[PDB]
């Protein structure tokens, strides 16, 4: 008998504290990241309005796929260009309670390169 | 790999059949093994703790975590944070290897060995074996030990019931009384 | 009767206004002694009332003392001028407000109960009346 904590629950416990000093505005939306064992998702959200201005993920059918790190980089590029189309340039990067090390870091760097200012 | 192979091959189907599990995921398994050596003599001489730590590391194959007294107790001449007692955690392949060696070699070498207890269950399917003395593990070398000492080996499994835990441990080989 | 401990050695005299907050009805016993006025009751008075009640009952039945002298009161010795801090603790009292059931009794015929409660009331400093369990 031993219980293995829900990793998503632990993520969200950290993510609340992260969000306490990160919020999305119309002129500086929140770039939230969510990570799955299979996929990864990015959302540009306006917390004031509570609406996802733009979205990208490993299910867009525009990302051919590959290694999960490479999929994250492709998703980062895709969200950056979609956000640019909607005129969104500056963003505040919400790492969603993860560690800014691997897949999330690759996604963030892809977004930075493709034009999101942060 | 012997004990892991034994488990996955023989034990898993046997437990599945015995306990009528809908899905294989329900099969109890040894999650981890935590071996704790409580050294109160550290207060008198830290070298006692150092020798105990060296013995435990040799026995286990991993550097132990040197636990510290969470509270200061005058009864034992103990101040909070004093490095009294050590432990090691073993999972996966190292866990299986150490458990197999304990079953085969170390247990027979125990003085006047008549088996292991059959009641040291927490009530949730986790067992603990209280070793009275070292020198039963072949790695000890029976000579380096200036002072003989014991330990407590806690086997933590996913078994929900003491019954399932007992079956798994027996199948893995446990000389219950 | 004295508390084993007190958080504060000295305490305000206080004010007794209105009915008792609780314990106005007989809980355990068959009969009870209800105070019709508000007044301090010393541990000495409680003990005197208890002795009277029990002795008349012949130590039979059961007796409950609902009140307890939680509060402490101090005093100043004769020949001491006003000031120089509060006086040293002297005695213990229970502030009893009208409607409180100070004593309860059971296990005895009604005449014995009424007579025992009458003796206890005469020992106490408050006007009282007899009440039956509902």
């Amino acid at each position: 008998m031993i219980t293995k904590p829900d990793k998503n629950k632990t993520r969200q416990k950290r993510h609340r504290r992260v969000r306490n000093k990160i919020s999305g505005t119309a002129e500086c939306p929140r770039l939230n990241i969510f990570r799955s064992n299979k996929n990864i998702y990015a959302q540009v959200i306006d917390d004031v309005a509570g609406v996802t201005l733009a979205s990208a993920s490993a299910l867009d059918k525009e990302i051919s796929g590959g290694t999960k790190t490479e999929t994250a980089a492709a998703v980062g590029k895709l969200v950056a260009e979609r956000a640019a189309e909607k005129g969104i340039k500056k963003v505040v990067f919400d790492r969603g309670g993860y560690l800014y090390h691997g897949r999330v870091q690759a996604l963030a760097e892809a977004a930075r390169e493709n034009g999101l200012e942060f | 790999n012997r004990l892991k192979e034994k488990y996955i091959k023989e034990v898993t189907p046997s437990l599945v059949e015995k306990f009528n599990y809908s899905s294989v995921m329900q099969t109890p398994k040894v999650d981890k093994i935590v071996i704790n050596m409580g050294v109160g003599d550290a207060v008198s001489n830290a070298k006692n703790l150092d020798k105990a730590v060296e013995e435990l590391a040799l026995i286990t194959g991993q550097k132990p975590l040197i636990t510290k007294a969470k509270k200061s107790i005058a009864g034992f001449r103990l101040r909070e944070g004093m490095p009294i007692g050590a432990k090691v955690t073993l999972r996966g392949e190292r866990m299986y290897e150490f458990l197999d060696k304990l079953v085969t070699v170390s247990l027979p070498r125990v003085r006047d060995f008549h088996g292991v207890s059959k009641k040291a269950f927490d009530g949730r399917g986790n067992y603990t074996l209280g070793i009275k003395e070292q020198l039963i593990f072949p790695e000890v070398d029976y000579d380096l030990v200036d002072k003989v000492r014991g330990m407590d080996i806690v086997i933590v499994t996913t078994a929900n019931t003491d019954e399932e835990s007992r079956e798994l441990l027996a199948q893995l080989g446990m000389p219950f009384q | 009767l004295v508390p084993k401990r007190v958080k504060h050695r000295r305490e305000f005299r206080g004010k007794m206004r209105g009915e008792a907050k609780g314990g106005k009805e007989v809980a355990f016993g068959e009969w009870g002694l209800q105070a019709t006025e508000s007044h301090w009751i010393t541990n000495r008075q409680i003990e005197a009332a208890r002795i009277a009640m029990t002795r008349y009952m012949k130590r039979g039945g059961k007796v409950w003392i609902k009140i307890f002298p939680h509060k402490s009161y101090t005093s100043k010795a004769i020949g001491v001028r006003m000031g120089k801090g509060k006086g040293a603790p002297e005695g213990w009292v229970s502030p009893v407000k009208r409607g409180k059931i100070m004593f309860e009794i059971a296990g005895v015929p009604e005449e014995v109960a009424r007579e025992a409660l009458r003796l206890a009331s005469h020992k106490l400093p408050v006007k009282t009346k007899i009440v039956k369990r509902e």
Binding site: - | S44, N45, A46, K47 | -
Partner: protein
């Protein structure tokens, strides 16, 4: 403080000054005690005795002014305390040296077929002059030097403690406490003994590199004491030690219940130890100790 004269004159002048200072502090304490005793008497008198209560407060003011001008007696500097005891017992033949020859490669043989035998609980003095082989012989016994010829045998009952001449047993980089760290002694035991050697509190965390030669000598001696050996190979132990500590060292060794192989050019230290047999160098001569030591020195 600078005096005119010699060492004795300084001691005479100093001893008198501390005596005259001590008497001053005594009399200042008596007057304070006198006032204190009266202040208390007034304090406990009846509140109705107005005059006594008044006088008590007046003397309380004088008592306060006294206690604020009362010279503190300087704490007398504490002397070293040594209690060297052997764990085990000496044998009748602690050390056997037989036909031992040794030469430093490229230099004349210091001694040829040197053979001596110590008896146990014996004060053995290795006499000689500078550059004659005294320290070489002691290094030979410990094992620092391997004998060119012969054998050196220690009885299994013999534990040996070595005090090197040049203080080569201390780590300058480490602290005092780190140097004395041993598997057989706990922390407070180390601190207690270091306090007996005048290393108090955070004085044990000082690096050995900043200590004076004399303070380092105490650490080496402390290491020797903590061994609790029954054979003491000491090479000029009193070197670097202040005259007071030398007498303490000699007196305690005299009472040591074990064998002592000592080298010392200090005439006072050898007298206190009470040497039994002296070994002269370079002319090997195992001899009974006596004022004939002077005869060898003359010759």
């Amino acid at each position: 403080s600078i005096y005119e004269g010699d060492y004795y004159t300084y001691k005479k002048k100093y001893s008198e000054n501390q005596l005259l200072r001590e008497k001053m502090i005594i009399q200042q304490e008596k007057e304070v005690k006198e006032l204190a005793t009266f202040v208390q008497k007034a304090k406990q008198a009846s509140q109705t005795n107005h005059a006594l209560k008044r006088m008590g407060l007046e003397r309380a003011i004088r008592l306060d002014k006294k206690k604020k001008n009362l010279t503190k007696r300087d704490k007398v500097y504490k002397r070293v305390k040594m209690d060297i005891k052997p764990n085990r017992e000496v044998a009748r033949t602690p050390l056997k040296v037989e036909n031992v020859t040794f030469h430093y490669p490229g230099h004349p043989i210091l001694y040829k077929d040197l053979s001596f035998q110590i008896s146990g609980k014996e004060r053995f003095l290795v006499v000689g002059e500078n550059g004659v082989g005294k320290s070489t012989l002691l290094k030979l016994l410990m094992g620092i030097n391997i004998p060119d010829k012969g054998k050196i045998i220690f009885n299994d009952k013999t534990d040996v403690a070595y005090y090197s001449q040049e203080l080569e047993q201390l780590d300058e980089e480490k602290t005092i406490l780190e140097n004395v760290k041993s598997d057989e002694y706990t922390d407070w035991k180390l601190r207690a003994t270091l306090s007996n050697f005048l290393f108090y509190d955070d004085d044990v965390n000082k690096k050995v590199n900043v200590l004076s030669p004399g303070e380092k000598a105490r650490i080496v001696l402390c290491k020797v004491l903590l061994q609790k050996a029954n054979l003491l190979i000491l090479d000029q132990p009193t070197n670097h030690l202040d005259p007071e500590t030398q007498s303490i060292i000699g007196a305690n060794f005299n009472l040591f219940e074990g064998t002592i192989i000592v080298v010392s050019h200090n005439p006072s230290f050898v007298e206190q130890i009470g040497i039994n047999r002296m070994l002269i160098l370079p002319s090997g001569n195992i001899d009974n100790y006596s004022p004939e030591l002077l005869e060898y020195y003359s010759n």
